Design a protein that fits this description.
The structure holds two protein chains of two kinds. Chain A has helices spanning 10-27, 107-110, 115-118, 122-126, 131-157, 166-187, 196-215, 234-256, 281-312, 320-359, 373-387, 402-408; strands at 91-92, 104-105, 365-367. Chain A is mostly helical. Chain A is 51% helix and 2% strand. By secondary structure, chain B is mainly β. The chains are: A mainly alpha, B mainly beta. Bound molecules: a molecule of 2 linked components (NAG-NAG) and 2-acetamido-2-deoxy-beta-D-glucopyranose (2 copies). Chain A: Residues 322-349 form a coiled coil.
């Protein structure tokens, strides 16, 4: 539905997902995984660096195998200025055309500032035995560099004034928070985008943790046989992120500090650490697809009416104003059916998983074209019992459909004369 | 032309799974799944997409989707894997009383357990291993020989089945058997 008004529970579910992440990480080696960038070595440099305050970090604080360049993390990223160009087209993943991916990568995710982690030298991290702290250094580096890039490129690809509007400041804080959450799914092997760079990037990660499990084994280790999990080192990578997540976010606050908005979705700039990383990745991209879609519809709609203002306020039926309005009403329709084609695969994949959790019982695990079935249906299953909707045949819960999810937790305000993702002057 | 989601599934016997067949054609002639498993179609407004609730899957199953796209009938299949803990795990009937020095043989029976690829059995004395081998045949027969020494007078002997679903995403499940304490005399 889109009667009574239903509660907002996105923060309540990731909170339980945060409680479970902590409790099982404390069962294993959470404390022996806490790190700070000040305790690592970079460039095989043993000289004192001033990484107490992580804001003081620079590009030289990196185990990049190249680092002959000036660009450290954002090297070869968005050479066409389309990362935050409003209304840019989304892409599909690459893997073998088996169980075709409904994963639509956001534009900020494709041009993510990660060139340092992609060309990482695994030696300089594990040659010393401080691989934990030497790893958080490069993670906080890409985190702080990308926060500087996102706030910068969004203000250029959309040409924002000095008094930035509060809806745009909220749109950036969410974009930064979406970037912080994507990073956590990279470390844990939860990332959906399978590119030639990501596979090599994940190849360095597996090697690094393989030394980290043996690093804190100084005897009995709580990660017995973790190499034979999918993703590899599943438990160890999940625990490592929980230990240092408050610091990866503290790294980005060094760049979010200059945004003058402190309420709403920028509530996490100064206070606290956000819970977006414990919300599944397919959902965070669904709301981001909804945002850039509503930003795209508002543009095409205002362009349409500037050409067709004549034809409904006097244009005759064959003049320039009708052919001008003919192309405008065909170009506007050409764009929406482009995007709704993506929304069709999204809404149908969302429906497959929500109902999958009602009939599948304890001990059901999936593996296919995408890794994230097993984590997705478990989120809904815990969600379906918090809302109480597990009988197959109930529609009270608005989370029954994909559009109903964006109605509750999404933040799409800018769609004009059409706020509908749900349904159940052009011809002069 | 035809797709299926999900692709590889591991579920406990007696449960349910939801499989979806979809085609690139948006008005295909026919669309359905072919499996001997009890299905129950769930009515959705999709005309190029049909979903089925397969109930009480007891063994391995490989259903296939068929959709009638004007370009030629297309097919796509899924692979279901069933798992369950072994039913009977038991040691060979042996007397509690043994004299010193005798050669003792111990067999452990493993009835069931699936999938046998990820199922191994261990023969233990207290919490020390003696032999560790996968489970083959039903009942899976595994044996080892121990010489009777009287310093283990009253020590517990047991075997344990051990199936791990860690690589596929689940937990490892294990079963201990009845303990046999030998009484050494002489
Ligand atoms: C073999 O072990 C499995 C667990 O690996 C047993 O199934 C569990 O039984 C326990 C009781 O010990 C229950 O608490 C669990 O809920 C059961 N788990 C599941 C997933 O079924 C099984 O009963 C054991 N078999 C024998 C013959 O003892
Ligand atoms: C059993 O585990 C092995 C890992 O040694 C794996 O290769 C195999 O696929 C598993 N068996 C299955 C999934 O049936
Ligand atoms: C099993 O071993 C323990 C060793 O501490 C012993 O106390 C017990 O008597 C043994 N036998 C049993 C429990 O039948």
């Amino acid at each position: 539905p889109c009667d009574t008004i239903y509660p907002a529970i996105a923060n309540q579910m990731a909170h339980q997902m945060h409680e479970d992440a902590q409790t099982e990480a404390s069962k294993r080696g959470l404390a022996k995984l806490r790190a700070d960038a000040k305790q690592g070595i970079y460039k095989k440099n043993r000289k004192p660096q001033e990484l107490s305050n992580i804001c003081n970090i620079t590009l030289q604080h990196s185990n990049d195998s190249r680092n002959g360049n000036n660009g450290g993390a954002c090297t070869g990223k968005d050479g066409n200025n389309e990362r935050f160009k409003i209304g840019t087209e989304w892409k599909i993943g690459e893997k073998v055309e088996t169980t075709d991916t409904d994963a639509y990568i956001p534009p900020r995710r494709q041009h993510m500032c990660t060139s340092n982690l992609e060309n990482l030298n695994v030696s300089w991290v594990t040659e010393d035995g401080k691989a934990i702290h030497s790893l958080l250094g490069d993670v906080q580096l890409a985190a702080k560099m990308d926060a500087d890039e996102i706030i910068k490129r969004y203000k250029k690809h959309n040409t924002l004034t000095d008094p930035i509007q509060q809806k745009d400041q909220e749109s950036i804080c969410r974009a930064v928070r979406y970037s912080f959450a994507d990073l956590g799914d990279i470390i844990r092997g939860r990332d959906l985008w399978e590119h030639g760079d990501q596979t090599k990037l994940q190849g360095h990660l597996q090697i690094i943790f393989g030394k980290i499990k043996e690093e804190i084994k100084k005897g009995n280790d709580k990660y017995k046989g973790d190499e034979k999990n999918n993703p590899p080192y599943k438990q160890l990578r999940e625990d490592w992120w929980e230990a240092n997540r408050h610091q990866v976010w503290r790294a980005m606050q060094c760049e979010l500090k200059n945004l003058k908005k402190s309420n709403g979705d920028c509530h996490y700039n100064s206070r606290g650490t956000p819970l977006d990383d414990y919300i599944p990745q397919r959902l965070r991209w669904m709301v981001e697809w909804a945002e850039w879609f509503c930003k795209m519809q508002s543009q095409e709609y205002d362009k349409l009416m500037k050409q067709c203002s004549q034809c409904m306020s006097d244009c005759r039926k064959g003049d320039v104003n009708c052919t001008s309005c003919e192309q405008a009403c065909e170009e506007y329709k050409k764009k929406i059916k482009k995007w709704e084609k993506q929304w069709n695969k999204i809404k149908d994949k969302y429906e497959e998983l929500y109902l999958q959790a009602k009939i599948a019982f304890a001990g059901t695990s999936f593996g296919g074209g995408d890794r994230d079935y097993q984590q997705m249906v478990h989120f809904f299953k815990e969600l379906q019992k918090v809302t109480g909707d597990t009988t197959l045949g109930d529609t009270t819960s608005p989370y029954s459909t994909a559009a109903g999810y964006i109605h509750q937790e999404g933040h799409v305000d800018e769609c004009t004369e059409q706020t509908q993702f749900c349904k159940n002057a052009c011809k002069c | 032309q035809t797709s299926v989601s999900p692709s590889k599934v591991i579920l406990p016997r007696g449960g349910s799974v939801l499989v979806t067949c979809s085609t690139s054609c948006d008005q295909p002639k026919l669309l359905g799944i072919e499996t001997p498993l009890p299905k129950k179609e769930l009515l959705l407004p999709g005309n190029n997409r049909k979903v089925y609730e397969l109930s009480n899957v007891q063994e391995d199953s490989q259903p296939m989707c068929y959709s009638n796209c004007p370009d030629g009938q297309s097919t796509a299949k899924t692979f279901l894997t069933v798992y369950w803990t072994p039913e009977r795990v038991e040691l060979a009937p042996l007397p509690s009383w043994q004299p010193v020095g005798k050669n003792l043989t111990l067999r452990c029976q493993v009835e069931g357990g699936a999938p046998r690829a990820n199922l191994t059995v261990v023969l233990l004395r207290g919490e020390k291993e003696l032999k560790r081998e996968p489970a083959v045949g039903e009942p899976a027969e595994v044996t080892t020989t121990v010489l009777v020494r009287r310093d283990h007078h009253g020590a517990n002997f047991s075997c344990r089945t051990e199936l791990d679903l860690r690589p596929q995403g689940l937990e490892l499940f294990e079963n201990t058997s009845a303990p046999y304490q030998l009484q050494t005399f002489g």
